[PDB]
Ligand binder design. Structure first.
Ligand SMILES: *C(=N)[C@H](C[C@@H]1CCNC1=O)NC(=O)[C@H](CC(C)C)NC(=O)[C@@H](NS(C)(=O)=O)C(C)(C)C
Ligand SMILES: *C(=N)[C@H](C[C@@H]1CCNC1=O)NC(=O)[C@H](CC(C)C)NC(=O)[C@@H](NS(C)(=O)=O)C(C)(C)C
Lengths: 305, 305
């Protein structure tokens, strides 16, 4: 028993991290087979960052201008190309530590692990959610770009995020591994704002089921609700609408605990209208929305990779 | 910017995890050089667990009774011995993935990462604190014993915890890698209770400095306090006494922000006496005590391994 914010084991991704330096700027890259993926702004100087023309800057760079290091070993670059906001550097050596992998584009509300890196070396791993406004609440400093986010399924690493930038509220934005940004953001130093965020309702419900599984049951009430009436309340508290797809995805936790989803909705409705009155759920004084139904099942059932 | 509960990268420890089975019970083991370390209760059956005589049970076991698997590969056991509450199984093959390592016994208030494993395979990584009552708030299921806790310093893994058991409140207890329990616990299925816990004051202060570094400064007041007067307040709210050693350890964060430790103590005293009035600090509605000063510096300065 117990419930923690748990990240995926990071070893498979650690063996793919490299350092990419072009001129004076060094960021991280992801080395898979004979290709290194990194943010395109590695080719910018400080003056270039207000409004860079990346295609122009890349035209003036040749393979040898890219210094790629894997540990203390230089990897020789033999080709380069730009795909959306990422550079693909072909190297003359395939990474022998390349895991089975896929590039996926995750949906808002889904979670992943981030392996935060500097100079191609890992500093830590934490779990994040793709927010409804297409930002993540991460922890990233200068030099962290090219750090990646990922899920693991058995032996397969699904890379879903590459880190590019920080937005005024202390929140983070990036691309999938094809270089397309999540959200309406661009890779330039100009004023950009995230849309208003919203609470991921299906995830709060998943975490309430995690609490029941752990014996923290005080908030269960005796009522039920309709899906339509729940959503009228959710709306006022800035919660996403709950869909029938979300109800189905909560099926395994509902079946395990014997609490119908609409009954858990009635209990959540009460928490939203009345507060927690100084109580905690799973140790938290606020309702938590960064665990998916799958995360709850995986942690409470001991799924391994 | 941003502040997350961040675990160490787990790859170095992942390459050491193995499965140990004796009879019907399977737990995890730690394979370093030619030795596998695991909890001694792998040799118990269900009937044995109320009050096992481990020395007696081990006398009746020979090397071949221990089935050790590293992935799909059986490792042949060639010797066995018991050290306190851990078994040491000598195997005929040294682990080629053994990192530089040390066995350390950590002090209450210190943090570590746990790599939770089942059947020798990792399921997730999370950060934990050794509580003042010598328990940890983890997330562990049947089969998780032998999962380890660790810190990393550059290239060196300091193993400090091996998981053995769960106590009535949903909290966890274990040993160092020499098999000595943290706390007054024994490895048997009998009623055991943890002492009353207390809040790790130096860590709350460290996290308040993390908040200042991130721009969350609303709680800073205009006052100072003496160390003695702060401790009189801390006492009433079940906080550990702050010592001059703790004040010195907070020196780097104090110097970085220009806030004297005793001035931050005055601000904490106000939070304890008055509450947060529905506000949050770094997103949390409760004061957080599972970040050490070192964790704050490492995360806010981008320390890598
Ligand atoms: C990548 N190494 C770095 C990560 C930032 C640095 C501080 N915290 C982070 O997450 N990315 C940047 O510095 C990017 C670079 C451009 C070309 C996208 N710039 C920013 O993130 C910028 N924010 S913005 C796009 O102007 O609103 C900063 C530097 C003002 C944070
Ligand atoms: C190790 N695999 C297992 C980990 C437990 C299982 C549930 N959550 C955990 O953390 N450890 C045990 O089952 C130990 C075994 C003995 C010999 C120490 N037993 C317990 O943890 C026991 N608690 S106790 C010592 O009786 O208070 C349980 C099974 C009642 C939780």
């Amino acid at each position: 028993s117990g419930f923690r914010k748990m990240a995926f084991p990071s070893g498979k991704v650690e063996g793919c991290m490299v350092q990419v330096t072009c001129g004076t700027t060094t960021l991280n890259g992801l080395w898979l087979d004979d290709v290194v993926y990194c943010p395109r702004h590695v080719i910018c100087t400080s003056e270039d960052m207000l409004n860079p023309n990346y295609e122009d800057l890349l035209i003036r760079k040749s393979n040898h201008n890219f210094l790629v290091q894997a540990g203390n070993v230089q990897l020789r670059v033999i080709g380069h190309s730009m795909q959306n906001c990422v550079l693909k550097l072909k190297v003359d050596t395939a990474n022998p530590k390349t895991p089975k992998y896929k590039f996926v584009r995750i949906q808002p509300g889904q979670t992943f692990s981030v392996l935060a890196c500097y100079n191609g070396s890992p500093s830590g791993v934490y779990q994040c959610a793709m927010r409804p406004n297409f930002t993540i609440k991460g922890s990233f400093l200068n030099g962290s770009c090219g750090s990646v986010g990922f899920n693991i399924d058995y032996d397969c690493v699904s890379f879903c995020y590459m880190h590019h930038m920080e937005l005024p509220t202390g929140v983070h934005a990036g691309t999938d591994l094809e270089g397309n940004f999540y959200g309406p953001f661009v890779d330039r130093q100009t004023a950009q704002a995230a849309g208003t965020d919203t609470t991921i309702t299906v995830n709060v419900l998943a975490w309430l089921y995690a609490a029941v599984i752990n014996g923290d049951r005080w908030f269960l009430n005796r009522f039920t609700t309709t899906l339509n009436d729940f959503n009228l309340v959710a709306m006022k508290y800035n919660y996403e609408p709950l869909t029938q797809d979300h109800v189905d995805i909560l099926g395994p936790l509902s079946a395990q605990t014997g609490i119908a989803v609409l009954d858990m909705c009635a209990s959540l409705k009460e928490l939203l209208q009345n507060g927690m009155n100084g109580r905690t759920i799973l140790g938290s004084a606020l309702l938590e929305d960064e665990f998916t139904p799958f995360d709850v099942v995986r942690q409470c059932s001991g799924v391994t990779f």
